[PDB]
Structures are given as structure tokens and as C-alpha cells.
């Protein structure tokens, strides 16, 4: 029913995504399936790289109510300061692992929406964390890449265990 999410260390998560050529109704349908997948997980961010569609498309909803959806197509993110903020990040492609990352605290976002309109906004807080995390997906990067090798290694061993439990849960 839902789209499968790739899990670390799947090598396809390292693919650099291609620009979206036109917001066609198949990219519209993909965005809608990404939302269902994301909301089911549950998560607040999913990049199209994570469902093995190597395209610059990101869906996001940062709200308690699952009612404030946002789409970023072909995004450009530029920091507006050297000040960073720590945040404990997770990732649906690194399931059930969370750790601290430090990223620029304020950024400018330029992207297009599901109608092909351009927009430009400035983001701090959770938005700035999340858009930078998701942009990293589109350049083949995961948040575990900023951790020490032992923490990455532990994360990898734990995730294979969770994925193996998830499969076993399908047989029951």
C-alpha cells in the first residue's frame, strides 16, 4: 500500500538526485504517496531519495496535527549565519536512531511547489534543521555521516536488527 523506505547502509541512499524537469501529474502522485508513507511512519520529513526515486523532491509537515504539509522541488538552501544550533535528529532511513547534529541556525530556501511556482522563504528553528537534513538526502548524505565512526557503526548494526525484526513481523 505505502512506498518502501530505504534503510542505511543501502548504497542507493548515496545517489545524488536529478532536478525535476517539470511538475507533471506523476510527480504530483509521487508527492502524495511520499506524504502517506511519511505520515504512516510516522515522520516529519521525507526526501524522494529515501523511496528510491532520485529526484529533487522533498515532503515535510512539521505540525502536531499532521495538517501543515509543505513541498520543496529543486531546492536551494543558503545559510544566513555562522551560528549553529544543536538538534537531536532522526531519519526514517536510519530507523529508530537519534543523535545530535549542529547546523547553521537560519537559512534561506528557494524552491518550487506542486504548481511550478517559485518561492523564497527564510527559516530558523525546526524548519532550518529539517530542510538542511532533507537537502543532504538529495546529495547522497545521511545525518550519521556527521557522527564519529563508532556511533555510525553502532547505528548500522542496530538498524539491520530493526529491519530484520520488521521483516519477521510481516511473517507473523
What positions carry a catalytic annotation? 134
Minimal distance in Å, beta carbon 128 to Zn ion?
15
CB of 17 or CB of 91, closer to Zn ion: 91
Contacts by 101-105, CB closer than 8 A, 24 or more apart: 101/129, 101/133, 101/143, 101/146, 103/128, 103/129, 103/132, 103/133, 104/79, 104/80, 104/128, 104/132, 105/81
CA distance 117 to 158: 41
Measured CA to CA, the distance from residue 73 to residue 59 in angstroms comes to 9
User: For 164, how many CA atoms within 13 A lie in the half-sphere containing its CB?
Assistant: 6
Residue 53 phi/psi, 5-degree rounding, is -125, 100
| 54 annotated ligand-binding residue | no
Name residues whose C-beta falls within 8 Å of residue 80's C-beta, 6 or more positions apart in sequence. Answer: 104, 106, 107, 108, 122
Closest approach of Zn ion to the CB of residue 142, in Å: 7
Closer Cβ to Zn ion, 71 or 91, answer by number: 91
Cβ closest to Zn ion, residue 73 vs residue 91: 91
137 is in an annotated binding site: yes
Q: Contact residues for Zn ion (CB under 5 A)?
A: 91
Toward Zn ion, which CB reaches closer, 23 or 131?
Answer: 131
Residue 138 C-alpha cell reads as: 538529495
Output the smallest distance, CB 13 to Zn ion, in A.
9
Grid coordinates of 101: 547534529
Least CB distance to Zn ion at residue 171 (A): 28
Binding site feature residues for Fe cation? 91, 133, 137
Binding residues: 91, 133, 137
Amino acid at each position: 500500500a505505502l512506498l518502501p523506505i530505504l534503510s542505511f547502509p543501502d548504497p542507493r541512499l548515496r545517489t545524488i538526485a536529478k532536478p525535476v524537469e517539470e511538475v507533471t501529474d506523476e510527480i504530483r502522485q509521487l508527492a502524495a504517496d511520499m506524504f502517506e508513507t511519511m505520515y504512516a511512519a510516522p515522520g516529519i520529513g521525507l526526501a524522494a531519495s529515501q523511496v528510491d526515486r532520485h529526484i529533487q523532491l522533498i515532503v515535510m509537515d512539521l505540525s502536531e496535527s499532521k495538517d501543515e504539509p509543505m513541498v520543496f522541488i529543486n531546492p536551494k538552501v543558503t545559510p544566513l549565519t555562522e551560528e549553529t544550533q544543536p538538534y537531536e535528529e532522526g531519519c526514517l532511513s536510519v530507523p529508530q536512531i537519534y543523535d545530535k547534529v549542529d547546523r547553521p541556525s537560519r537559512v534561506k530556501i528557494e524552491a518550487i511547489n506542486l504548481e511550478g511556482q517559485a518561492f523564497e522563504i527564510e527559516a530558523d528553528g525546526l524548519l532550518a534543521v529539517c530542510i538542511q537534513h532533507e537537502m543532504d538526502h538529495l546529495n547522497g548524505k545521511l545525518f550519521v555521516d556527521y557522527l564519529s565512526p563508532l556511533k555510525r557503526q553502532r547505528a548500522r548494526e542496530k538498524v539491520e536488527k530493526i529491519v530484520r525484526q520488521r521483516e519477521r513481523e510481516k511473517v507473523a
